[PDB]
Structure formats: C-alpha cells, structure tokens
Amino acid sequence: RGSHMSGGLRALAAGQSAPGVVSIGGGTVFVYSGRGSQWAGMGRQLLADEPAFAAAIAELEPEFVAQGGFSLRDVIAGGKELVGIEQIQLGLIGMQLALTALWRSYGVTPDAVIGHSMGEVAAAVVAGALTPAQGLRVTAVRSRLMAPLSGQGTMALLELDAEATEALIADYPEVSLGIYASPRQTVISGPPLLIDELIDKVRQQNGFATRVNIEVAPHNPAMDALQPAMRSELADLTPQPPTIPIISTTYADLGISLGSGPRFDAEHWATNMRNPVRFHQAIAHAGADHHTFIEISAHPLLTHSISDTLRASYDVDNYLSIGTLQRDA
Ligand code: NA
Ligand code: NA
Ligand code: NA
Ligand code: NA
Numbered sequence: 245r246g247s248h249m250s251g252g253l254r255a256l257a258a259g260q261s262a263p264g265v266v267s268i269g270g271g272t273v274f275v276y277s278g279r280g281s282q283w284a285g286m287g288r289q290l291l292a293d294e295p296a297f298a299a300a301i302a303e304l305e306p307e308f309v310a311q312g313g314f315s316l317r318d319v320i321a322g323g324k325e326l327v328g329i330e331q332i333q334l335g336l337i338g339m340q341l342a343l344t345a346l347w348r349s350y351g352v353t354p355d356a357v358i359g360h361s362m363g364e365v366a367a368a369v370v371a372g373a374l375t376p377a378q379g380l381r382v383t384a385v386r387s388r389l390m391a392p393l394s395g396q397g398t399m400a401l402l403e404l405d406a407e408a409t410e411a412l413i414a415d416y417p418e419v420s421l422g423i424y425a426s427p428r429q430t431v432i433s434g435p436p437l438l439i440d441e442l443i444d445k446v447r448q449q450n451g452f453a454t455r456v457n458i459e460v461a462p463h464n465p466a467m468d469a470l471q472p473a474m475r476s477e478l479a480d481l482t483p484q485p486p487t488i489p490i491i492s493t494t495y496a497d498l499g500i501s502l503g504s505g506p507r508f509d510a511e512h513w514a515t516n517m518r519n520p521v522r523f524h525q526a527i528a529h530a531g532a533d534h535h536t537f538i539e540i541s542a543h544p545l546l547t548h549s550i551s552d553t554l555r556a557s558y559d560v561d562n563y564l565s566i567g568t569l570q571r572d573a
Contacts, residue, residue: 249569252266268562272352272353272355272538274357274358274370275363275550276540278363280335283542283571287569288321290569296345297346303376304342304376308338312330312334312384328391329387330388337369341379343540357371357491358530360521367490378483386513390470390517395436396435397433398433399433399462401429401456402432404430406424418465419433419434419439419442419464421520423520425524426553427553463519467518471518478509481509490506491529492526494512494522496522496525500529537565538568542569542570547566551563
C-alpha cells in the first residue's frame with residue numbers, strides 16, 4: 245500500500261519496477277535534510293510491511309535507549325510526537341538511516357551523499373566516515389547543547405538570492421545568511437523578532453518569505469557559544485575517511501579540495517553547526533555527473549531547491565529529483 249511513499253519508492257515496493265530502477269543519466273546522490281518533518285503515524289506502516297526498515301529501527305534502538313533515553317521504535321509504532329530539539333534531532337537521524345536501509349533493500353544505494361545542515365551527520369554515517377553509534381552521539385551532544393536555546397532563535401526561507409539576502413540583512417548584525425538554498429532562495433537565521441521583521445519586509449517589498457519550522461538559530465553567530473562544549477564532549481570522537489564521496493555543505497570548498505580530505509571529527513561538527521550551509525553549491529557540483537537526486541526524509545522539502553539549482557546549470561530533462569516519504573497520502 246505504502247500510502248506515504250514517493251512514486252519511485254512505491255513502484256519498487258510493489259515490485260512494479262526492477263531492482264534499483266527508480267531518459268535519465270547515470271549516478272545517484274542521496275540528500276540528507278537538516279529539518280525534522282515528523283508527520284502523524286510516520287513510519288508506522290513501514291515498520292510492519294518493510295523488513296529492511298524494521299531491521300534498521302531494531303538495530304538502532306539499543307543505542308537510542310542508552311544514548312537518548314528515548315525509544316524511536318515506540319515513537320514510530322505509537323505515532324508519538326517527538327518533543328524537544330533532542331528528540332527531534334535524534335528521531336530524524338534514526339529515520340534517515342532506516343530509510344537509507346529501505347532504499348538499499350530495493351537495490352538503490354548512493355554513489356555520493358550530500359548533507360544539508362544537521363543532515364550532514366547522517367551523510368557522514370552513510371558515507372562511512374562515522375558509525376551509526378557515532379552519528380547518534382554527535383546528534384545527542386549537539387542537540388543537548390542547543391536545547392536550552394529553544395525559542396531564542398529561528399530561521400526563514402526567502403525568495404531572494406544570496407547577494408540580495410546579504411543586502412537585506414546588512415543592518416542586522418544578529419541575523420546571518422544561514423543556508424544557500426538555491427540560486428533563487430536563501431535562508432536567514434537569528435532572533436525570532438528580527439526574523440519576523442525581515443519576513444515582513446520581504447513580503448512588503450513584493451517578495452515571498454516563510455518561517456522555518458525550527459526554534460533555534462543554527463548557522464549563525466549564536467552558535468559560537470556552543471563550539472567549545474562541542475569540541476570537549478566529542479573530544480573522543482574518532483572518525484574514518486569516507487568510502488563514498490561526501491560533498492560537505494559545511495565549507496566554502498565543499499570539503500573536496502585537492503590534498504587532505506575533511507576529518508569528520510569534533511571540530512568539523514562544531515564548524516558545521518555554525519557555518520552557513522553551502523547547499524546550492526553542493527548540489528551544483530553533484531549534478532555535473534550525477535543525475536538522480538533522492539531526498540532521504542519523511543517529507544520532501546528540498547526537491548524544489550534541488551531542481552532550481554540543477555535547472556540553472558544543466559538540462560533537467562535528463563535529471564530526477566525525488567523524495568522518500570511524504571506527509572500526504
Ligand atoms: Na524492506
Ligand atoms: Na543500510
Ligand atoms: Na554503530
Ligand atoms: Na574509528
């Protein structure tokens with residue numbers, strides 16, 4: 245039935261498509277979003293009808309119980325709301341890894357991964373730079389550090405390019421450019437009263453602007469306060485070089501410069517939560533030679549931005565930008 249599956253996944257789930265199928269060009273990129281997008285009953289039918297999904301949830305559950313005092317298995321089965329930044333972030337990465345297992349069971353695996361904002365932890369796990377246990381650990385530490393800030397920040401998506409956004413916020417020292425979303429959209433981050441003021445200005449100047457469903461201000465100066473504790477608590481984190489190309493959204497150079505490769509260690513995660521998200525540039529880089537982009541999320545929020553980026557550089561008739569699950573049935 246898969247009422248909440250994307251077309252590509254549902255077709256594989258029923259067996260209508262052949263293994264790994266999803267004309268398009270070659271290459272597949274898995275995109276891990278940074279936003280929690282829980283919807284009522286998320287994963288409930290998956291847990292009962294998709295053994296690969298259920299195995300992943302089962303395998304994560306012991307670490308969650310002991311690393312998070314929270315049961316993802318019970319959230320999914322009981323359709324419980326994730327409450328608080330810690331449950332939201334921890335639940336999201338569990339869903340991301342379990343959904344990656346689901347695609348794998350139907351022959352769909354990534355040739356490269358992209359992590360958007362906090363979704364770069366999940367990307368690093370799937371690329372082999374971190375183990376699932378290490379991914380939970382990073383998520384647990386960071387989310388606990390951000391939880392006390394709940395309600396002191398937010399973000400907003402604006403129908404402005406990056407330089408127009410920097411112009412808008414020039415006189416707003418507390419507001420930052422948070423995400424380079426596409427050539428046409430940019431996310432700002434900062435104190436909620438000021439984000440609301442900027443949303444209104446964009447609308448009154450005949451543009452489009454929306455609040456992000458988030459109650460902190462990542463990718464902003466506010467995060468400086470948290471970086472020392474990040475480096476201390478994750479001091480013992482020992483990552484490995486990735487085995488799948490990972491295009492990092494943390495750095496201007498996408499973490500793919502000649503020479504040494506990024507080390508996905510405590511400093512990287514402290515940097516990832518503070519630096520602006522180079523999502524536009526990572527997608528552009530990836531679309532040079534990869535033609536299928538799959539957002540690994542509970543509800544597709546990046547597929548339009550992906551398509552906008554790809555359309556600016558490539559012939560999108562040869563491309564496919566899809567999600568995994570969606571809140572509508
Ligand atoms: Na399965
Ligand atoms: Na897997
Ligand atoms: Na592990
Ligand atoms: Na290691």
